[PDB]
Design a binder for this molecule. Structure first.
Ligand SMILES: CC(C)CCC[C@@H](C)[C@H]1CC[C@H]2[C@@H]3CC=C4C[C@@H](OC(=O)CCC(=O)O)CC[C@]4(C)[C@H]3CC[C@]12C
Ligand SMILES: CC(C)CCC[C@@H](C)[C@H]1CC[C@H]2[C@@H]3CC=C4C[C@@H](OC(=O)CCC(=O)O)CC[C@]4(C)[C@H]3CC[C@]12C
Ligand SMILES: CC(C)CCC[C@@H](C)[C@H]1CC[C@H]2[C@@H]3CC=C4C[C@@H](O)CC[C@]4(C)[C@H]3CC[C@]12C
Ligand SMILES: CC(C)CCC[C@@H](C)[C@H]1CC[C@H]2[C@@H]3CC=C4C[C@@H](O)CC[C@]4(C)[C@H]3CC[C@]12C
Lengths: 666, 666
C-alpha cells in the first residue's frame, strides 16, 4: 500500500553510484582538487539557488501540515541541546567551546537536498506527493534556528584564542547571525517567499525553462562533487577521537530518528491512523540522512576540528545507506502477510546478491590481473571472494529453481550453503593467518593444508546434514530447507568461526633496499585486519539469530528482523570485500619553465649522492614551494616532467609515483 | 498546428541565460579557467556518455524514417566537399592542408546536444515527438563520416614537418581513424547499439535511476561550461582573417540549412503533404545550430588555426540565436491568417521589448552607478539607452492600450514613435561625435545643442505628423497608425540618419602619468564604432523595408518578412547596447610561501627605481615563471599577496588589478 518500497533500491543505486563515479574520477587523478572547485561553485551558487527558488515560489502555504515541521524541529532542538550540554560538561577547557560549536551542528544538520530528496521522491511520489514539499521546508528552517548558536560558540572560542577581552557580546552575536544570513539557502528561501507572495504562486513562462534547466542539474553534479571531496579525507586517528566519532555518528543516525518518531507520535493527533503511521515512518526515514558537507565547510572556515568533522561526515555518508535500506524494509514489514513477507525477503536478498556478484567479479578480475596473489595473504582473500561469488550465484539460481526441479533444488542448496559455510570458515582461517603473521615467525605456512581444510570442512558438514537431515521442499526460505539439523550445524559452524576469530585476534644497494621495501609494503595488513574485524559483525548477527530461534521455539515479533539482517549480511558481505580490495605543447612549456627559471636551488635538500632523489621528498618539496596544491597535482607535474625527458627512473621501469622510488636528473 | 512556436522564446531564454550565467561567473573570476576543467571533464566523460547510452538503448530502429537522415548526411557531405575543395584551391601552400583539415569541419559539425536538443524538444515534443530521436541519430553518424577525412588532412600537415615522403599512408589513415574512434560519442553509441540488440530495447530498472541522474545534468552543465569557455576568446584579428571568418559562418549558418531543405525536398517523396512540409521545415533550422566547441578542442589538440577557429565558434554561437528565432517564425508564418499574423508579430515584438527593457534598465543602473557619464561620449550613450528603454516601455503599454482608449492610445503612439525617431537620430549624433573626436580638435562640443536637437527634432516630427496626418484606429500595427504620411516621415528620418552616419564614418610623475593613461583609456572609442555599425545595419533594414513598401503599393509575399525584421530590430536593439555596455589560513600560507622561498629574483627585470612595478608586468612575470595559468590566476594571486600585507599601491586607493598601476613592496 503506502510507501512503495520496491523503488528504493534503484534510488539508492543512483545516489551512491554517482558518488562512486565521483570518487573514482577524483582518485584516478582525472579531476584534481583545484578542478573540483569549479563544479563545487556551480553546484552551490547557481543550481541549488535556482532549485530552491523554483520550489519555494510554488508551495501553497495554506495547505501545509505544520505538525510534522514542529515535531522535526523539536527533535532536532532536543538533540542539539543534549549534545551541546554533554560536550560543555565533558570536554577539556582548552578547546571546549569550539567542540560545543561544531559537535551539535554535526549531529543535527543532514544532507537532504542531494541524497535525501531522491529517496523521498522515490518512496513517496505516487502515494503521498505532499511529503516532497516538506524537505524544502525543514532543511532551511533548521539552519535558521540551530546554526547561529554553534557559530556564536565558535566565535566565543575564537575570542578566547585571540585573548582580545575588549570585545563585547554584541559583535559576537552580530558575526554569528551574519555568517548564517550569507548562506545562499537562507536568503534564497526568503526571496522565494517574497516572490511567492508577489506573484500569486505562479512562475512566469519566460523563466520557467531557465529555472528548470538550472535545477535539473543540481542532484547529479552534487553527488559527483560529494564523491570527489572524499578522495583523501579518511586518515588514521587515535582511540579517543575514534570513540568521539562513533558517539557522534550514533547520535546522528540512531538517536535522532527515534526522537523524530517519538515527537511525531506525541504532537500529531489526527484521524486516519494509516496517515499517522505513514507520518511516523516518514519522520524515522528523515532522521537517518547523513551529515551534510556544509558542516565540514564550516569547520574549514573556522579552522578548528576540521579533521574529525571531515572524517565523521565521510564515514557517516557510507554508513547511512544500509541503515536506510534496512529501516525502510523493517518499517514496511508490519503491513504484510507471512508469505509475501518471505517473498520480499527473497527478493531483497536476490537484488543484493546480484549487485554483489557484479561487484565481486569486477574485484576478482582486478585481483587476477594484478598477479599479486602468489604471496600470502592474498590467495586466501582470493578464495574468500571466490566463495562469496559462488554463494551469490547459488542464491540467484535458487530464486529460480526454488520450485522448478527437485535434483536441481538439492544441488543448488548444497552449493549455496557449502559456499556460505566456506565463507564463515574462511573468515577464521584468514584471522589465523593474520595472527600467525603477527608472531613474525619464519615458519612455513601450510597453505595446502589450510586451503583443503577450508574447502572441505563445509562440504563434509553439508554431506552429513544431507545424510542425517530430513528434506523439506515446502519451505520458501533456504535456511529452513532441512530444519533442526541445518540450524544446529549452521550454529556450530558460526560458533567455531567466531571462536577462531576471537582467539586469533649504478646502485645495487638502492635497488635491493627499494625492492625489500616494496615486498614489505605489499603485505597490506591494515586492510586484511579491517576485513577480519568487519566480518565478525555479521557472524555475530548470524549466531545471535540462530541462538534466538533455537531458544525461542515460539516465533515472537523479533525473528523477522533477525532474518532480514542475517540475509542482508549473508548476501551483501561481498560489498565490504569490494570496498576494501577493489580500489605535446604543454609538456615542452613546463619543461622549459622548470629548466630555465627555478631549476636552481632545487637540488639543495632532496637530492644527495648515493652509491638521486626519492619520490615522496620531491612531492613534499613541490608542495612546500607552492607549485602544487595536493599530492595529485604534484604527481601530474612529475609525470609532465618525466614525459619531457627531465628526470628518469634508475631502472627505467616505473613512471612518476609517490612511492620510495629513486629518480635521476638528465 | 504543427511546430508550436509560442514556446520557443522561453527555450532560447533558458539556453542563452545559462550561457550568460557561465560567462558572467568566468569573467567575474568566480570560477577560474583551471577550475573549469573539472566541470568540462564531468560533462564530457560522465553525463554525455550516460545520456547517449540511455537514448541509444531504446530507439526502435524498425520505425525510423531514413530519408531525413540520408538528406541531412548528403547536405553535410556536399558542404564539406565544397569547403574543402575551395580551401585547397585558394589557400597558400604554406598551410594549405591544415586549413583544409579544419575549415570543412568547422562549417559542418554543429552543437546539437546542448543547444539544439532543448530547442527541438520545445518545438516538437507535442506535435511530432519522433523528431526528437533524429538528433541522436544525426550528430554521431556525421562525425563517423566526416571527422576522419579532415583529421587525415591535418596529419598530412604534420607529415609536412617530418620530411619523410616515403612513409606512411597506412599510418596516416590509422591515426586519422584512431583519433575519431576514441571520441566518447562514437563508441558510446556503438555500445548503445550492442546493448539495444542484447537487451531487446529494455533497460533494467536497476540502472534506470542512475542513467537518468547522470543524463539529466548534462544540458545545464554543458551550457554553463560553454559560457565559461568564452571569457577571453574574442580578440582583434586581421582583415583577411575577418573575411575568412565571415565566409565560414555564412557557410555554416546560411548555405547548410538551405542545402538541407533542398535535399529533403528532392529525396523525401512521401504522402501527407502537411507532414512533408513539417519535415522539410525541420530540415531547415537543423543547419542553423552553431559550431560545436569540439572543433576548437580539435584545433587546440592539433595546435593549428586555434585562434580563428575559437573566435569563429564563439561568434557563430552568439549569432545563431536571432537567426533561429526569425527563421522559425518566418517558416511558421505561411500557416496563418492575416489578423493572427499581425497578433503574432505584436506578441513577438512585445516579448523582445520586455526582455530588452529589463536588460536596458539593468545597464542604465550600472552606468548611472559607475558615475562615468560626465565625459564624452558616455552621456550620449546614456541618452540612447534612455530612448531605447522608453520605446520598449511605450510598446508594452501600447499592446494593452491598442484598442482601449482614444487619448491614451494617441499619447502612447506619440511617445513610442518619438522615442523611435530619437534612437534613429541618436545613432547619427553618436556617429557625428565619434567623427569629431577622430579629427582630434581641441574645440568645445556643444553638448547642450546636440542633446536639445536629438530630443526635440523627433518631437517636432511627431507633432507635425499628428497635425497633418489622419487617424486610423482600425490598424493593430502601430506603423500604419496614420498611413502614408507616417511612412514618409519614418523613411525621411531613416534616410537622414543613414546619410549622417555614412558622412561621419615618490610618485611625482607616476601619479599624473597613470591619471593621463586612465583618462585616455576611458574614451572607449573601439566599442562605439561597433555599436554605431550594428545600429546602422538595422537602420538600413528599416529604410529598405520602407522604400519597398513605398514603391510596391500592392502587397506581395515579401512585406511580411520585412515587417518582422523591422519589428525585431526596433524592439530588440537594446540587446546590442546591453552586450556592448553592461558587462585566512590560505592568505598567510601564500604570503610566507612567497616571502620565504622565491621572494628573491623578483626584482631583476620588472622592478626599477622611479622618481615601483606595474601590475601588468607582475602578472606577465608570474605567468612566465609558472605560478599562474592565465590572467585570472595571476590576479587572484596578487589579491592574496595584497590582502596579506606584501605589496601596496602608492596612493593606497586601488586594489590589485591588471592595469598600469604602480605597486611597492612592504
Ligand atoms: C546497502 C545496499 C543494499 C545498497 C547499495 C549500496 C552501495 C551502492 C554502497 C554500500 C557501501 C558503499 C561503499 C562504502 C565505502 C566506500 C569507500 C569509499 O572510499 C573511501 O571511503 C576512501 C576515502 C579515502 O581514502 O580517503 C569509496 C566508495 C565506497 C566503495 C562505497 C561505494 C558504494 C557502496 C558499495
Ligand atoms: C534573439 C532574441 C529574440 C532571444 C534572446 C537572445 C538573448 C538571450 C541573447 C541574444 C544576444 C546575446 C548576447 C550576445 C553577445 C554577448 C557577449 C558575450 O561576451 C563576449 O562575446 C565577450 C568575449 C570576450 O571578451 O572574449 C557574453 C554574452 C552576450 C552578452 C550574449 C547574451 C545573450 C544574448 C543577449
Ligand atoms: C550488509 C551489506 C549489504 C552492506 C554493508 C555496508 C557497510 C557495513 C560496509 C560496505 C563497504 C564498507 C567500506 C569499504 C571500504 C572502506 C575503506 C576503509 O579504508 C575504511 C572502511 C570502509 C569505509 C568500509 C566501511 C564499512 C562499509 C561501508
Ligand atoms: C535584433 C535583436 C533582437 C538581436 C540582435 C542580436 C545580435 C545582432 C547582437 C546581440 C548582442 C550583440 C553582441 C554584443 C557584444 C559584443 C561584444 C563585442 O566585443 C563584439 C560584438 C558582440 C559579440 C555583439 C555582436 C552582435 C550581437 C550578438
Amino acid at each position: 500500500p503506502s510507501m512503495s518500497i520496491t523503488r528504493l533500491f534503484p534510488a539508492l543505486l543512483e545516489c551512491f553510484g554517482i558518488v562512486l563515479c565521483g570518487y573514482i574520477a577524483g582518485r584516478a587523478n582525472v579531476i584534481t582538487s583545484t578542478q573540483a572547485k569549479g563544479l563545487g561553485n556551480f553546484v552551490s551558487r547557481f543550481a541549488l539557488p535556482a532549485l530552491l527558488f523554483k520550489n519555494m515560489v510554488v508551495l501553497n502555504f495554506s495547505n501545509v501540515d505544520w505538525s510534522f515541521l514542529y515535531s522535526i524541529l523539536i527533535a532536532k532542538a532536543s538533540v542539539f541541546f543534549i549534545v551541546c550540554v554533554l560536550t560543555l560538561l565533558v570536554a577539556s577547557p582548552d578547546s571546549r567551546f569550539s567542540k560545543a560549536g561544531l559537535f551539535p551542528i554535526f549531529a543535527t544538520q543532514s544532507n537532504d537536498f542531494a541524497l535525501g530528496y531522491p529517496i523521498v521522491e522515490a518512496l513517496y511520489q505516487t502515494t503521498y506527493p505532499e511529503y516532497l514539499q516538506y524537505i524544502y521546508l525543514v532543511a532551511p528552517i533548521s539552519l535558521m534556528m540551530l546554526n547561529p548558536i554553534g557559530f556564536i560558540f565558535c566565535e566565543i572560542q575564537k575570542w578566547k584564542d585571540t585573548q582580545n577581552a575588549s570585545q563585547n557580546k554584541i559583535k559576537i552575536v552580530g558575526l554569528g547571525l551574519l555568517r548564517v544570513l550569507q548562506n545562499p539557502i537562507v536568503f534564497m528561501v526568503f526571496i522565494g517567499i517574497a516572490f511567492n507572495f508577489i506573484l500569486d504562486r505562479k512562475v512566469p513562462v519566460y523563466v520557467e525553462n531557465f529555472l528548470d534547466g538550472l535545477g535539473n542539474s543540481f542532484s547529479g553534479s552534487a553527488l559527483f562533487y560529494l564523491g570527489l571531496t572524499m578522495v583523501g579525507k579518511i586518515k588514521r586517528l587515535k582511540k579517543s577521537a575514534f570513540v568521539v566519532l562513533i558517539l557522534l555518528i550514533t547520535a546522528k543516525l540512531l538517536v535522532l530518528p527515534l526522537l523524530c518518531r517519538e515527537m511525531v507520535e506525541l504532537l500529531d493527533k489526527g484521524d486516519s491512523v494509516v496517515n499517522h503511521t505513514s507520518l511516523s515512518n516518514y519522520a524515522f526515514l528523515y532522521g537517518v540522512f547523513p551529515v551534510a558537507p556544509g558542516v565540514a565547510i564550516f569547520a574549514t572556515q573556522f579552522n578548528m576540528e576540521v579533521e574529525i568533522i571531515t572524517s565523521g561526515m565521510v564515514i557517516s555518508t557510507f554508513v547511512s545507506a544500509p541503515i536506510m535500506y534496512v529501516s525502510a524494509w523493517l518499517l514496511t514489514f508490519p503491513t504484510m502477510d507471512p508469505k509475501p513477507l518471505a517473498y520480499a525477503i527473497q527478493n531483497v536478498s536476490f537484488d543484493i546478491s546480484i549487485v554483489s556478484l557484479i561487484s565481486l567479479i569486477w574485484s576478482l578480475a582486478i585481483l587476477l590481473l594484478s598477479k599479486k596473489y602468489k604471496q600470502l595473504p592474498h590467495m586466501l582473500t582470493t578464495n574468500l571472494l571466490i566463495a562469496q561469488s559462488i554463494v551469490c550465484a547459488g542464491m540467484m539460481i535458487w530464486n529460480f529453481v526454488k520450485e522448478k526441479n527437485f535434483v536441481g533444488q538439492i544441488l543448488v542448496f548444497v552449493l549455496l550453503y557449502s559456499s556460505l559455510y566456506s565463507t564463515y570458515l574462511w573468515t577464521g582461517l584468514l584471522a589465523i593467518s593474520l595472527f600467525l603473521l603477527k608472531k613474525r615467525e619464519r615458519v612455513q605456512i601450510p597453505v595446502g593444508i589450510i586451503i583443503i581444510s577450508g574447502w572441505g570442512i563445509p562440504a563434509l558438514l553439508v554431506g552429513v546434514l544431507l545424510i542425517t537431515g530430513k528434506h523439506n521442499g515446502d519451505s520458501i526460505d533456504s535456511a529452513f530447507f532441512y530444519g533442526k539439523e541445518q540450524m544446529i550445524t549452521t550454529a556450530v559452524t558460526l560458533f567455531c568461526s567466531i571462536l577462531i576469530a576471537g582467539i586469533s585476534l649504478q646502485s645495487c644497494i638502492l635497488a635491493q633496499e627499494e625492492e625489500q621495501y616494496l615486498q614489505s609494503g605489499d603485505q597490506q595488513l591494515t586492510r586484511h585486519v579491517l576485513l577480519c574485524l568487519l566480518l565478525i559483525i555479521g557472524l555475530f548477527a548470524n549466531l545471535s539469530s540462530c541462538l534466538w530461534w533455537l531458544f525461542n521455539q515460539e516465533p515472537g515479533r523479533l525473528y523477522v528482523e533477525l532474518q532480514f539482517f542475517c540475509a542482508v549480511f549473508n548476501f551483501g558481505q561481498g560489498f565490504i570485500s569490494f570496498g576494501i580490495f577493489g580500489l605535446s605543447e604543454e609538456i615542452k612549456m613546463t619543461c622549459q619553465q622548470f629548466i630555465h627559471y627555478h631549476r636552481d636551488l632545487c637540488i639543495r635538500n632532496i637530492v644527495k649522492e648515493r652509491r638521486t632523489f626519492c619520490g615522496c621528498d620531491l612531492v613534499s618539496w613541490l608542495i612546500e614551494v607552492g607549485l602544487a596544491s595536493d599530492r595529485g597535482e604534484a604527481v601530474i607535474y612529475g609525470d609532465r616532467l618525466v614525459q619531457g625527458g627531465v628526470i628518469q627512473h634508475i631502472t627505467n621501469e616505473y613512471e612518476f609515483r609517490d612511492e620510495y622510488l629513486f629518480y635521476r636528473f638528465l
